[PDB]
Design a protein around this motif. Sequence first.
Motif, short mmCIF file in Angstrom:
data_model
loop_
_atom_site.label_atom_id
_atom_site.label_comp_id
_atom_site.label_asym_id
_atom_site.label_seq_id
_atom_site.Cartn_x
_atom_site.Cartn_y
_atom_site.Cartn_z
N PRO A 41 41.37 39.78 44.99
CA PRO A 41 40.90 38.85 46.36
C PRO A 41 39.54 39.55 47.01
CG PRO A 41 42.80 40.34 46.85
CD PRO A 41 42.04 41.19 45.69
N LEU A 42 38.62 39.90 46.37
CA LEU A 42 37.27 40.31 46.65
C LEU A 42 36.62 39.53 47.68
CD1 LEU A 42 35.56 42.69 44.22
CD2 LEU A 42 36.32 43.27 46.39
N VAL A 43 36.57 39.87 49.18
CA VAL A 43 36.12 39.10 50.00
C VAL A 43 34.62 39.73 50.04
CG1 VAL A 43 38.19 39.17 51.32
CG2 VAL A 43 36.49 40.87 51.93
N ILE A 44 33.65 38.85 50.41
CA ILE A 44 32.32 38.96 50.45
C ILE A 44 31.77 39.08 51.88
N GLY A 45 31.09 40.37 52.21
CA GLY A 45 30.25 40.24 53.23
C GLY A 45 28.75 40.47 52.93
N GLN A 46 28.13 41.43 53.47
CA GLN A 46 26.83 42.02 53.28
C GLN A 46 26.47 43.39 53.78
N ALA A 84 34.92 29.91 51.44
CA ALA A 84 35.71 29.11 52.31
C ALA A 84 34.67 27.96 52.64
CB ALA A 84 36.50 29.62 53.34
N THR A 85 35.09 26.79 52.29
CA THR A 85 34.31 25.53 53.14
C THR A 85 33.84 25.58 54.43
N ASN A 86 34.79 26.26 55.18
CA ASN A 86 34.50 26.58 56.47
C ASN A 86 35.12 28.24 57.02
#
Lengths: 55, 54
Positions: free
Chosen positions: A48-53, B5-7
């Motif tokens: 579930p690698l969420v993406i920020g920056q 996510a679309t939103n």
Amino acid sequence: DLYSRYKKLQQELEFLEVQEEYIKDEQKNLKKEFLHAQEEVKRIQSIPLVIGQFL
Amino acid sequence: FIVKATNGPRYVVGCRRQLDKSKLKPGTRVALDMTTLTIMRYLPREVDPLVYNM
């Protein structure tokens, strides 16, 4: 003393060699543990690698 | 599959089992897992209500 000092040279080399042995089996054990660590490094993750920056 | 996510924010997850990645490429509309956000089902794109009105 050839029948004392010289003979006394083994009074400790036995434990010496025993610990020199045990360092090998403990190399083995610590290798086991390091493999465990490397295993646990990336097994829950990267799914579930969420993406920020970076900032 | 790098997603956003679309939103909401963006993430990278996978499909369930057989959503047929063959036709599944960046742009197609998909659904996501409740828990792990993983793709559970892709579906045809929107229809933009005004079209149905016409």
